Write a protein that binds this ligand. Structure first.
Ligand SMILES: *C/C=C/c1ccc2c(c1)C(C)(C)c1cc(N(CC)CC)ccc1-2
Length: 133
């Protein structure tokens, strides 16, 4: 479905390390990140999205409108400037972040009370699954 609203709790997280390594995240912050609980809160009204990812130590919040390019500065991730664009490819929510890294972005599939998330950077894909709280 297109409706991604909800509080989403992580069920699984595969190749998180490899993805963070492809983004050049400090080996320090990687070790912290693998231990922290991650809650994904999405607020969706029409084309307008507010996404908040929250750990005990890190917040990653981004707001966007589907179909409208936006400049992004990944301050609490790898601290790069990208040109981001989120679109629908059928029911798949796709994000393409143009910049230094190739193949960079993420795809979200909402299947009922499950959310599947693939994050990509270079030749690395991290695969996550959340359950609606
Ligand atoms: C639809 C999901 C997109 C998206 C963008 C940015 C991040 C995420 C998902 C998370 C939840 C995978 C995430 C986690 C983090 N750290 C903790 C807050 C871990 C590296 C940063 C950015 C994003």
């Amino acid at each position: 479905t297109r409706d991604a609203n909800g509080t989403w709790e992580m069920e699984s997280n595969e190749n998180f390390e490899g993805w963070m390594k492809a983004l050049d995240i400090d080996f320090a912050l990687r070790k912290i990140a693998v231990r922290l609980t991650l809650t994904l809160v999405i607020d969706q009204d029409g084309d307008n999205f507010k996404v908040k990812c929250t750990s005990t130590f890190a917040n990653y919040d981004v707001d966007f409108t589907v179909g409208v390019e936006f400049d992004e500065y990944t301050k609490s991730l790898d601290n790069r400037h990208v040109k981001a664009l989120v679109t629908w490819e059928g029911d798949v929510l796709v994000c393409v972040q143009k910049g230094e890294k190739e193949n960079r972005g993420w795809k979200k599939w909402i299947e009922g009370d499950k959310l599947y998330l693939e994050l990509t950077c270079g030749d690395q894909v991290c695969r996550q699954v959340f359950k609606k709280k």
